[PDB]
Amino acid sequence: LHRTYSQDCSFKNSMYHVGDYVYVEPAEANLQPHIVCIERLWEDSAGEKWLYGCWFYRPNETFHLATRKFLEKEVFKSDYYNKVPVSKILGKCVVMFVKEYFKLCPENFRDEDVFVCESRYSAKTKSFKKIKLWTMPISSVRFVPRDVPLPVVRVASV
């Protein structure tokens, strides 16, 4: 299965790039699509197009104390990396580092598809840790100053 890697990948009417975030179809009729950062793309010798990257967990996808507070739209950088066929992408989204999320917003994305990341999460130890520096592929999305900054809302889930 010789693979030809690329910085971008076309599928139907869509074009995907390394550094994009995408929603990926889960293995359950009623289950939220997963957020994955595209870190590599390829076409294999069978003609199938694939992405590989890091999974981002929503709060309800973590084991957490009932009292833990979450930002609105918060997601967690997991230690889970896997490949997915490009045919399973349901759409694009954006995850922003906590330091820029409140001041900047991505051009051409609905607010519901923009998430904020402050911490990583490990399923192995069921624990969180604040991220010191944001290390992800450079994305092609364009960020502009928000007209008015978003409020900082941290509340528990339960």
Swiss-Prot record:
Residues recorded as bearing Phosphoserine in the entry: S6, S45
Outcome of substituting P137Y: Found in a colon cancer cell line; requires 2 nucleotide substitutions
Top-level taxon of origin: Eukaryota
Tissue: Widely expressed.
Domain named BAH: residues: 14-132
Localization per Swiss-Prot or TrEMBL: Nucleus
Biological function: Involved in transcriptional activation and repression of select genes by chromatin remodeling (alteration of DNA-nucleosome topology). Required for the stability of the SWI/SNF chromatin remodeling complex SWI/SNF-B (PBAF). Acts as a negative regulator of cell proliferation.
Disease: Renal cell carcinoma: Renal cell carcinoma is a heterogeneous group of sporadic or hereditary carcinoma derived from cells of the proximal renal tubular epithelium. It is subclassified into clear cell renal carcinoma (non-papillary carcinoma), papillary renal cell carcinoma, chromophobe renal cell carcinoma, collecting duct carcinoma with medullary carcinoma of the kidney, and unclassified renal cell carcinoma. Clear cell renal cell carcinoma is the most common subtype.
Subunit-level organization: Component of the SWI/SNF-B (PBAF) chromatin remodeling complex, at least composed of SMARCA4/BRG1, SMARCB1/BAF47/SNF5, ACTL6A/BAF53A or ACTL6B/BAF53B, SMARCE1/BAF57, SMARCD1/BAF60A, SMARCD2/BAF60B, perhaps SMARCD3/BAF60C, SMARCC1/BAF155, SMARCC2/BAF170, PBRM1/BAF180, ARID2/BAF200 and actin. Interacts with PHF10/BAF45A. Interacts with acetylated 'Lys-14' of histone H3 (H3K14ac), and may also interact with other acetylated or methylated Lys residues on histone H3.
Protein name: Protein polybromo-1
Originating organism: Homo sapiens
Gene name of the encoded protein: PBRM1
Residues of the full protein shown: 943 to 1100 of 1689
